[PDB]
Amino acid sequence: DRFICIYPAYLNNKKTIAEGRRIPISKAVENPTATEIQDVCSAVGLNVFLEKNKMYSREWNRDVQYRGRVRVQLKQEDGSLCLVQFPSRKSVMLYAAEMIPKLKT
RNA sequence: GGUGACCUCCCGGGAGCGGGGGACCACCAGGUUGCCUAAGGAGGGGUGAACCGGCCCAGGUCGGAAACGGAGCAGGUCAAAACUCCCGUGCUGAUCAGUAGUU
């Protein structure tokens, strides 16, 4: 239950910083989905679980392609980093951003 | 000096979110002014909706165990998106009396 949250808004290049986004547009992507996010995180060997029915507070678009939240574990609950490659939320996001595009395209 | 946006960094957080460094843009107030006008007030208003302003936001809604918060509707509201009318100012058609002043 002590896992960092991650909304797809954080990575969406068609959203302003005030609309949620957490990473520079240059590194961001178009319309990332919680599904896409979970898949690229898990596939690197991260412990991730997907909450299909959480919405972003700042998200306004009531249709399914923008719903969803991805929870990720960084820590084994002895305080140590599950992985050394992923110390921070930002380190997660930037990676997901880097990996999502190799899927569909 | 102010407002609103937008971009890019840190920092704290399980969320909504919290702390802080830069960059840029728009507008505002009112303090000096000009290689400035034919004349250019630092006026007065109104719209600000079907989503585009900003603010306050019932409900609802998203996040939350909750506190509370986000986004924001109906309604209210504006020194400060944008739009627009009026006043002033400048040129510029025109009207009336057959009015004069003087023939």
Side-chain angles (χ1 to χ4, degrees), chain A residues 1-103:
Chain A
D1 282 337
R2 300 318 277 196
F3 293 2
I4 48 102
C5 280
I6 283 183
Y7 289 98
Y10 296 169
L11 310 180
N12 214 311
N13 63 16
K14 287 215 288 206
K15 285 191 181 297
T16 59
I17 280 171
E19 285 173 294
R21 180 181 55 97
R22 278 280 193 299
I23 56 171
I25 297 137
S26 41
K27 303 169 200 170
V29 304
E30 177 163 335
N31 306 125
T33 73
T35 306
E36 283 172 345
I37 294 178
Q38 157 168 75
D39 284 0
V40 294
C41 275
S42 181
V44 83
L46 279 166
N47 188 26
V48 308
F49 77 84
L50 161 79
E51 296 188 290
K52 299 181 176 179
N53 287 318
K54 286 294 162 189
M55 277 155 263
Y56 192 19
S57 297
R58 297 179 189 176
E59 181 44 67
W60 137 93
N61 187 289
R62 298 270 174 176
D63 295 350
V64 48
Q65 343 87 292
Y66 301 106
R67 72 177 18 171
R69 174 166 82 187
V70 167
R71 313 277 300 282
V72 180
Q73 177 200 358
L74 291 179
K75 290 135 58 175
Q76 295 159 341
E77 204 111 25
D78 50 14
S80 63
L81 296 176
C82 276
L83 299 171
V84 296
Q85 178 174 10
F86 306 114
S88 75
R89 310 159 141 88
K90 185 154 295 301
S91 54
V92 187
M93 301 187 296
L94 290 164
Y95 177 79
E98 188 180 37
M99 288 304 284
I100 296 176
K102 293 179 179 179
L103 173 64

